[PDB]
Amino acid sequence: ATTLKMGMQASVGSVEYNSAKMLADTLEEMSQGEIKLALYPSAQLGDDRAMLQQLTLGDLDITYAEFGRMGLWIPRAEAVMLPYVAKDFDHLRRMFESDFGQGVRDEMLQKFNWRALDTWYNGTRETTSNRPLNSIEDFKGLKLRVPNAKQNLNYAKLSGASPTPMSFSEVYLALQTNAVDGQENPLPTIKTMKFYEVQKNLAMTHHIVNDQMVIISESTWQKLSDTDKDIIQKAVQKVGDAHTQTVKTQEAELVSFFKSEGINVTYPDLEPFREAMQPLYKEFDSNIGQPIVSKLAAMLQHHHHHH
Ligand SMILES: [Co+2]
């Protein structure tokens, strides 16, 4: 009997939690009850940084972490979270699977005892506002609320908007009174926070593409049998396929929902946004001493291929 422990920030009822339960059920089935998964939701074991440390120490078996979040530990990995580098999740997954991604994953394993098993799509951030954003030119004068995060700030600044720091629980009222003109977040968050009640427009800016890696402690991995390793890897990939499709499906449902609420949904040309980020890309590559971002942004050879 092997009961793995999996920690996550997400709450019961969330997509992330539902996928973890699907993983538990899939492991049970595939192992005829030999592999179990116990779930520790709602950051009860700490935030992602804390749970990742538990993996390093061998005290927790599995957790979620974003590929770009590895930039905190492995500086070059931040390249994947610069705005507009990843065109979409497929592109991000290609980065994960590339020689670049393999190198980052090897370092995660060697230094921190993190074995990345898979990357799962977890949504794309989009931009709401009190006036239509038909193109990058419309960002001029836009008081755009972003979280206190470097890359979100760069998105706001380089698009030509006026970045406007502000506490998340205050945003609804700031949008309502036009103290701030817009904000940027994933579609489910926009729904949950009812930002659509106080924002007449939504722009499909696709500026930040999110994922979640599934990481297992190398301490745990090395105790598993060869066959159990394969079962876990394949269980994670199966659940990953389901998770990614669920997130994609829910995003399309959310766009339709917002339209049904009377929201004006725009699809601005994104090439000018990518062009506007070039200062940032060149700075990143210059500082790190390798053409990391330019290579990743252009890594489109297998884009949308069936593998
Ligand atoms: Co291909």
Report residue 264 as tokens. 């004006």
Alpha carbon distance 21, 306 (integer Å): 27
Report residue 187 as tokens. 């579609």
Question: How many residues are given for the chain?
Answer: 307
Tell which residue, 141, 137, 135, 127, has the closest CA to residue 196.
127
Ligand 1 center–CA 93 separation, angstroms: 12
Amino acid of residue 122: N
Cβ atoms of 38 and 188 within 8 Å: the answer is no
Cβ atoms of 176 and 198 within 8 Å: the answer is yes
Residues 91, 144, 189, 114, CA torsion sign? positive
Tell which residue, 233, 208, 198, has the closest CA to residue 62.
233
Alpha carbon distance 48, 29 (integer Å): 28
The experimental technique behind this entry is X-ray
**How many Cα atoms are found within 13 Å in the side-chain-facing hemisphere of 235?**
24
Alpha carbon distance 52, 5 (integer Å): 13
Cβ atoms of 114 and 73 within 8 Å: the answer is no
Name, in order, each residue with C-beta under 8 angstroms of 14's C-beta and a sequence gap of 6 or more.
41
Ligand 1 center–CA 273 separation, angstroms: 27
Buried b (16+ CB within 10 A) or exposed e, 42-65: eeebbebeebbebbbeeebbbbbb
> In the chain, helix, strand, coil percent, each to 5?
50, 20, 30
Report residue 185 as tokens. 């977040």
Domains of the chain and any CATH numbers: 1-307 (3.40.190.170)
Ligand 1 center–CA 210 separation, angstroms: 22
Residues near ligand 1 ion, CB 5 Å cutoff: 302, 305
The label of the residue with tokens 């020689």 reads 99
Report residue 252 as tokens. 């399309």
Question: How far does Cα 180 stand from its chain's mean position?
Answer: 25
Burial of 305 (0-12, 13-18, 19+ CB in 10 A): exposed
Rg (CA), the chain: 20
Ligand 1 center–CA 94 separation, angstroms: 10
Alpha carbon distance 14, 38 (integer Å): 16
Ligand 1 center–CA 301 separation, angstroms: 7
What is the DSSP annotation of 192-260? Answer: HTTGGGG-SEEEEEEEEEEEEEEEEEHHHHTTS-HHHHHHHHHHHHHHHHHHHHHHHHHHHHHHHHHHH
Give strand pairing partners of 36: 3
Ligand 1 center–CA 286 separation, angstroms: 30
Alpha carbon distance 237, 167 (integer Å): 37
Ligand 1 center–CA 307 separation, angstroms: 6
Ligand 1 center–CA 288 separation, angstroms: 29
Ligand 1 center–CA 91 separation, angstroms: 12
Cβ atoms of 63 and 51 within 8 Å: the answer is yes
Amino acid of residue 276: A
* Torsion, Cα of 251, 237, 22, 191 (10° steps): -10
Give strand pairing partners of 237: none
